[PDB]
Design a protein around this ligand. Structure first.
Ligand code: MG
Ligand code: MG
Ligand code: MG
Ligand code: MG
Ligand code: MG
Ligand code: MG
Ligand code: MG
Ligand code: MG
Ligand code: MG
Ligand code: MG
Ligand code: MG
Ligand code: MG
Ligand code: MG
Ligand code: MG
Lengths: 205, 159, 58, 169, 291
RNA sequence: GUCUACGGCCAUACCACCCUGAACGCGCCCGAUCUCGUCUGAUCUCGGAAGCUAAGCAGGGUCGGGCCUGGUUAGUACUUGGAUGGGAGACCGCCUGGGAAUACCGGGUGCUGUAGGCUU
RNA sequence: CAGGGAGGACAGAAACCUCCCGUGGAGCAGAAGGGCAAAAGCUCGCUUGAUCUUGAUUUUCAGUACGAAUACAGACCGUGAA
RNA sequence: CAAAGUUUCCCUCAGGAUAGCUGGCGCUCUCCGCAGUUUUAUCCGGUAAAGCGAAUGAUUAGAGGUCUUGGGGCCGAAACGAUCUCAACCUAUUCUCAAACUUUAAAUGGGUAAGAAGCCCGGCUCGCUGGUGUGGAGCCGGGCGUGGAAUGCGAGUGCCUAG
RNA sequence: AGCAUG
RNA sequence: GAGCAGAGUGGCGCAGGAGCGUGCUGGGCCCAUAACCCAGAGGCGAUGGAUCGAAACCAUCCUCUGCUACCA
């Protein structure tokens, strides 16, 4: 029995985390952020898709979990059971307070913790999907379906990078061949030219 | 209402800079302060004796009494609608000299030098400082290569 | 019956109606609060200053 | 080979932890005093363990440190008792080693009933000339990286000097 | 495993002591308490007598502190005592007393107060302190800088202090740490201090050691035997050294010598040099890998 | 060129490992009679000069970590004053001025005062 | 110093002894913040400046008082070689 | 001519005293000084922002290691002899944060200075300080006006005082 | 003096 | 919702250096059961902290019990 999200959808109060001052906070509804086939190498999931936020507002953990569930369900139905990867890139740290009534009035009117919401900025990613290059329209449709579970405006944008990395897809193969990139599971490691050359010869031998 | 503590709100004001804790350098103690000098007040948290009140931190005063370990300095303090010039005692650690007066001393020495010069010679010399004058007329040489054309780039959503 | 608690709304105008006057200054300042030993010696020097008058004049 | 790299015994540290205070602790102090030839010192307990029966600041152990010819002769007696048999793991990775003895009469000291039976704990620290700069006052420094003593060097020194045997395990 | 303590965070949050403390040279607590001049003294110099005992000689200096660095007004080393006659024993109590006396006399000769304030011409061992005489310029006053040494009873820094006091400086002190103060009884006799000043303990050691075993005697004294000094000559020769120091305390500098400008160290390698060194290493490694 | 004594600024000086040190010096090093202090002459204090650069120490090195100073991030973020600007709002744009910080990419790796030496 | 690593008869996950690393990650009576490493912490030795006195100044501030604090000055003392 | 609902104290909160805002009466000068402003120098700070490959406190995810321990076990009486392992642990990375976190760090802003009360010479006094008529301070005499950034403006000072 | 039951 | 009291051997209770009566188990007396007699076993609501040391001290919680929640 929680209030409608319109009561808590605006970034009105200062950031207020669960710390040694704020205690008794109930845990968030979203407890899993990564799912799909997350044991996959960076080589085989080149395509990336984002859910870019368009407003400065607050998102609830319940909404985040609902959107996660919707996206996973559609991706399982469409792209197979383990042909994708979903990463929710928002963690609810801001805790909201409710002043529960019933007749004290506004005397001593400081609320108790109710739940946790995530404060989001303009152009901040909400969700990311990593999958094969062929599944572009499936990713777009999954994000479109997940959009309806969030208040406000969001937009789907296909990233220029390679997978869940910060390096461009066009030059990714060039750089990994030229040995500046060492794949290390989900991501990749960038090798500078400034260490001891013992590491350089170890890589080159 | 806040408290009336003597060190309330000095958490960062009296804290030492990063990687500069420990023993105080000796040159600060070894500076000499005559009476009538101009002094910048800045509290140092390493020493708890003769610490100035937090209202004087960042202010500039004038020495009037030199003592064994401290100096008496006259500072201006604004309270409500009036300004009071009141006297405090501050230890040598919380004290630095001010270069603002040294600049003017250098300028006045040069001014007297430049007055005693170019006076037996009969020529006139400017002494006052004038504000930044408007730029005079000048030419700009485009020797060969022409100014390149700049146009706004098309928009794309990078992120 | 609650009322307003604290405010500084009109105070800046009230202050600058008559102006923020800097402390009055004089060429000579009082010698209060300075070191008693140094005052004692200064007073002795002033008191005995009289006896170099003839040499000063010459 | 440089003379100033020769291994040597800085000191041999002996102690008996009787675990309690009073007459038995004094008897153990007499044991090691007669053993070495210098008055020992008493160590206190820093915490309180009900199961061990020791309270805070209670004298429960006695120890002494011997340096020089007396140190080498006492170490020779101890290794004679233990017939020159040390394990590989008895040697510390920093260059020291030690062992215990379950009965101190074996060292070759007369038994007197008013003292009784006590077990010892031998621990020698190997040295090298120039180690005193680490604990001197005026200009303290490290002791270098090559100049340090290793476990392998301590083992080899032991087996070549006390012509002993090292058993693995 | 074990968590590494000295990592990037450790090194980028590390804050080093002063350079002198890092090298162990100075003690900044006593430094601050001893060199700082009082504020209403207005840059009046505050003097120190530095006494440093080295493994092979003794260094005594008179200095005052300035912002640019300590300024030293006089210095007298123990290694110049062979000029005055002391051949060996340049790091004992007698040498400490002699070098302190030499420093005091040299400072007095520099300042022109050497005829006045003669101090103790004939040393008696007991307490003495020069009293400033009226009319004439006042006596020089300084303080003892013991450094990091343990100021326990019978110390060569206090021997040097006594030498300077006999020379004629007004150094505040007490005759409690002079060798000869008996702690269990709390009095001070002067004849034992005279023996320590003249080297009689060393002479008694030589007599005792050559009486017991000549091998140990020769091992403990070889340059002594070379300079053929016996236990029966030390009092006379140290008295002669005192008289000579009081006679000619001036210091004459060694003449400057021509230099052929030969570098003994290695100059720092250059940027292109090390870059091409790395390039050569890479080329050689790749060549070996192909081979 | 370089060291010692006392220092100033307190990492461009720190930390890890490796190489070299002519002469002086600083050191390690040899002993406890004396002064002095310990369970222990290990530390401290004292009396020395058989030996040694092994160590401290100094100079150099590492596509070194750190530190310092630049570029990029970027006129981006943020922000003074303005509009009867847009937008249901949340917020955003323009005018007038100022203007940053990681990641990433280069360069550098103690200066210096007083006194005293060595470099026949 | 917290802590960690490697060793030693009973002894162990935890008793005591030894070496190494250890920028404070400990402690400083109490709440929090600041400050502190040959110290402001720990251990020793001596002690009673927690004593007598007139003024000046700071903090709240009306530039009133109490409380608390700062820099001196005059006695008499402690401590340290200083 | 022209306000205040503000500071401190009161068994005070529908009231007072007190400072502030106001008026009136003047007086000391004028026909250098001051400024709700800028400029030039110089200090001061920990907000916005930013950071977590940096301290503290939260925090998601895969990787590479090892015997440091525990387990599922199996080969073996067994064995740090060994197999997969699940793990914690260590090492490079990675996603997301902090009013009571921070290495960094603005915009706006807060002091001081821009001379005659300033400089430069000569000498006397001191019971303070003193290696040294050393240091500092105070006194007498003399000499230097291009009043030493912009802009604007007549200033100062004392009583009484209502709301 | 206490002493129920099958 | 605010104040407040109380959680401990199977059940009811005492309480700064783990126990009572009853229950339970073994053996006795009796033909046998209880009563009676001799012995024994059995465990501080949770977390964190002050303390040389706490079940007892200090905070937060998990339950449960009681008292008020008036005036129109
Ligand atoms: Mg609010
Ligand atoms: Mg009101
Ligand atoms: Mg000292
Ligand atoms: Mg020795
Ligand atoms: Mg060496
Ligand atoms: Mg070497
Ligand atoms: Mg580097
Ligand atoms: Mg130099
Ligand atoms: Mg030659
Ligand atoms: Mg101390
Ligand atoms: Mg009252
Ligand atoms: Mg009314
Ligand atoms: Mg703040
Ligand atoms: Mg922020």
């Amino acid at each position: 029995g929680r209030r409608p999200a319109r009561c808590y959808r605006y970034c009105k109060n200062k950031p207020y985390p669960k710390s040694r001052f704020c205690r008794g906070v109930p845990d968030a509804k979203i407890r899993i952020f990564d799912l799909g086939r997350k044991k996959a190498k960076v080589d085989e999931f080149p395509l990336c898709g984002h859910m870019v936020s368009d407003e400065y507002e607050q998102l609830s953990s319940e909404a985040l979990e609902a959107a996660r569930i919707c996206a996973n369900k559609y991706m399982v139905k469409s792209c197979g059971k383990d042909g994708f990867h979903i990463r929710v890139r928002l963690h609810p740290f801001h805790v909201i307070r409710i002043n529960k009534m019933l007749q004290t009035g506004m005397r001593g009117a400081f609320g108790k913790p109710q739940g946790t919401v995530a404060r989001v900025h303009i152009g901040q990613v909400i969700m990311s999907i990593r999958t094969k290059l062929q599944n572009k329209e499936h990713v777009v449709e999954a994000l479109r379906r997940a959009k309806f579970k969030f208040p406000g405006r969001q937009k789907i944008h296909i990233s220029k990078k390679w997978g869940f990395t910060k390096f461009n897809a066009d030059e990714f193969e060039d750089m990994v061949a030229e040995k500046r990139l060492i794949p290390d599971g989900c991501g990749v490691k960038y090798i500078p030219n400034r260490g001891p050359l013992d590491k350089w010869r170890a890589l080159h031998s | 209402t806040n408290t009336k503590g003597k060190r309330r709100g000095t958490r960062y004001m009296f804290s030492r800079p990063f990687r500069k804790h420990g023993v105080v350098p000796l040159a600060t103690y070894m500076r000499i302060y005559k009476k009538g000098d101009i002094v910048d007040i800045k509290g140092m948290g390493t020493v708890q004796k003769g610490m100035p009140h937090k209202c004087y931190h960042g202010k500039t005063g004038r020495v009037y009494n030199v003592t064994q370990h401290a100096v008496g300095i006259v500072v201006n303090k604004q309270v409500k609608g009036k300004i009071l010039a009141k006297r405090i005692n501050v230890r040598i650690e919380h004290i630095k000299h001010s270069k603002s007066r040294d600049s003017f001393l250098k300028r006045v020495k040069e001014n007297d030098q430049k007055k005693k010069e170019a006076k037996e010679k009969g020529t006139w010399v400017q002494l006052k400082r004038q504000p930044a004058p408007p730029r005079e007329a000048h030419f700009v040489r485009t020797n060969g290569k022409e100014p390149e054309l700049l146009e706004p780039i098309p928009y794309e959503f990078m992120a | 019956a609650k009322s307003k608690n604290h405010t500084t709304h009109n105070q800046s105008r009230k202050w600058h109606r008559n102006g923020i006057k800097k402390p009055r200054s004089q060429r000579y300042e009082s010698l209060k609060g300075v070191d008693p030993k140094f005052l004692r010696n200064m007073r002795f020097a002033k008191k005995h200053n009289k006896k170099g008058l003839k040499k000063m004049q010459a | 080979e440089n003379p100033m790299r020769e291994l040597r015994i800085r000191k041999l540290c002996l102690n008996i932890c009787v675990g309690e205070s009073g007459d038995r602790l004094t008897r153990a102090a007499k044991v090691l005093e007669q053993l070495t030839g210098q008055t020992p010192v008493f160590s206190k307990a820093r915490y309180t363990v009900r199961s061990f029966g020791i309270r805070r600041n209670e004298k429960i152990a006695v120890h002494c440190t011997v340096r020089g010819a007396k140190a080498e002769e006492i170490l020779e007696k101890g290794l004679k008792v233990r017939e020159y048999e040390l394990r590989k793991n008895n040697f510390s990775d920093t260059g020291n080693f030690g062992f215990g003895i379950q009965e101190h009469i074996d060292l070759g000291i007369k038994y007197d009933p008013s003292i009784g039976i006590y077990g010892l704990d031998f621990y020698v620290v190997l040295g090298r000339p120039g180690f005193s700069i680490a604990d001197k006052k005026r200009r303290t420094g490290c002791i270098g990286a090559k100049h340090r003593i290793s476990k392998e060097e301590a083992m080899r020194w032991f087996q070549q000097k006390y012509d002993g045997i090292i058993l693995p395990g | 495993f074990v968590k590494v303590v000295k990592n990037k965070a450790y090194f980028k949050r590390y804050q080093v002591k002063f350079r002198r403390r890092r090298e162990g040279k100075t003690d900044y607590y006593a430094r601050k308490r001893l060199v700082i001049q009082d504020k209403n003294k207005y840059n009046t110099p505050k003097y120190r007598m530095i006494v440093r005992v080295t493994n092979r000689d003794i260094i005594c200096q008179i200095a005052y502190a300035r912002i640019e660095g300590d300024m030293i007004v006089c210095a007298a080393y123990a290694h110049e005592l062979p000029k005055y006659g002391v051949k060996v024993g340049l790091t004992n109590y007698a040498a400490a007393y002699c070098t302190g006396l030499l420093l005091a006399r040299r400072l007095l000769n520099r300042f022109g107060m050497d005829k006045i304030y003669e101090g103790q011409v004939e040393v008696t061992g007991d307490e003495y302190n020069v009293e400033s005489i009226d009319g004439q310029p006042g006596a020089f006053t300084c303080y003892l800088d013991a450094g990091l040494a343990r100021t326990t009873t019978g110390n060569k820094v206090f021997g040097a202090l006594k030498g300077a006091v006999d020379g004629g400086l007004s150094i505040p002190h007490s005759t409690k740490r002079f060798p000869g103060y008996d702690s269990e009884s709390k009095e001070f006799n002067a004849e034992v201090h005279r023996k320590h000043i003249m080297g009689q303990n060393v002479a008694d050691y030589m007599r005792y050691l050559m009486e017991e075993d000549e091998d140990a005697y020769k091992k403990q004294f070889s340059q002594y035997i070379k300079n053929n000094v016996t236990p029966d000559m030390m009092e006379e020769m140290y008295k002669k050294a005192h008289a000579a120091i009081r006679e000619n305390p001036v210091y004459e500098k060694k003449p400057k010598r021509e230099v052929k400008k030969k570098r003994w160290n290695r100059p720092k390698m250059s940027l292109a040099q090390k870059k091409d060194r790395v390039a050569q290493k890479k080329a050689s490694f790749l060549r070996a890998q192909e081979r």
